[PDB]
Amino acid sequence: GMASVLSAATATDQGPVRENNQDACLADGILYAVADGFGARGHHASATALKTLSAGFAAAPDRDGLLEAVQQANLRVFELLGDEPTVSGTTLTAVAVFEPGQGGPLVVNIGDSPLYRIRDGHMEQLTDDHSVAGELVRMGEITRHEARWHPQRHLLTRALGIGPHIGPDVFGIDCGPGDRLLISSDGLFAAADEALIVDAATSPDPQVAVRRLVEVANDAGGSDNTTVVVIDLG
Numbered sequence: 001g002m003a004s005v006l007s008a009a010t011a012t013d014q015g016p017v018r019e020n021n022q023d024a025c026l027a028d029g030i031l032y033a034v035a036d037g038f039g040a041r042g043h044h045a046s047a048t049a050l051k052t053l054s055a056g057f058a059a060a061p062d063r064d065g066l067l068e069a070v071q072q073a074n075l076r077v078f079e080l081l082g083d084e085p086t087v088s089g090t091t092l093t094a095v096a097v098f099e100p101g102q103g104g105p106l107v108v109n110i111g112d113s114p115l116y117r118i119r120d121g122h123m124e125q126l127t128d129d130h131s132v133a134g135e136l137v138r139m140g141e142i143t144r145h146e147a148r149w150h151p152q153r154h155l156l157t158r159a160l161g162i163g164p165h166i167g168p169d170v171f172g173i174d175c176g177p178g179d180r181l182l183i184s185s186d187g188l189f190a191a192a193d194e195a196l197i198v199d200a201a202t203s204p205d206p207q208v209a210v211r212r213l214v215e216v217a218n219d220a221g222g223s224d225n226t227t228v229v230v231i232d233l234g
């Protein structure tokens with residue numbers, strides 16, 4: 001029989017516009033994550049968040065430990081960056097592909113770096129975006145497609161590292177053998193045709209998929225950093 005995780009891949013692309021790649025990603029064991037930093041020290045925010053997340057999860061690799069690790073990541077980023085004259089911080093979306101005995105696969109997310117499930121050729125977003133546009137989706141006022149073009153898409157309503165308390169979303173992931181999970185920064189959906197994103201995201205080899213995903217985003221203009229983590233489930 002097959003393992004729960006068959007394989008995983010990551011890619012990140014600065015793009016031709018941004019002067020820094022302030023995204024970060026993690027793929028290690030059953031833990032996968034993307035962090036999209038913002039502000040003058042957004043690179044520091046996303047890298048520190050993932051370093052802290054990784055260490056905390058390793059110390060306690062269960063649901064409560066993951067949640068604790070996210071809390072510790074928040075506090076560490078805020079302790080390091082909170083006295084700056086402008087605000088820097090990061091999104092964080094973390095997936096732990098737990099076995100059923102540990103409650104099954106789990107997502108913890110803050111900000112707007114979505115988790116998607118790819119199943120039978122369809123790609124759908126499982127997480128809510130904590131942005132002005134994303135809150136309008138959560139309120140049932142606009143569609144996710146509409147949110148891509150909303151003029152305040154870029155303004156976050158929740159972020160890691162900006163204050164001492166955070167309330168991430170936490171939920172099980174309804175997935176199973178043959179599904180693919182994708183974690184992405186918001187750069188992926190900045191501009192490109194959705195069909196071509198899906199074409200890339202369904203590439204059978206996950207290492208091809210991640211390269212094609214960031215190429216699609218770059219070819220469309222590369223206005224933002226794009227980072228993707230693909231996980232194939234068995």
Ligand SMILES: [Cl-]
Binds near residue numbers: 218
């Ligand atoms: Cl480029």
Ligand SMILES: [Mg+2]
Binds near residue numbers: 015016017018019
């Ligand atoms: Mg450049």
Ligand SMILES: [Mg+2]
Binds near residue numbers: 037
């Ligand atoms: Mg960013």
Ligand SMILES: [Mg+2]
Binds near residue numbers: 036112154186
């Ligand atoms: Mg953004």
Ligand SMILES: [Mg+2]
Binds near residue numbers: 153154186187190224
């Ligand atoms: Mg964006």
Ligand SMILES: [Mn+2]
Binds near residue numbers: 185187224
């Ligand atoms: Mn971004």
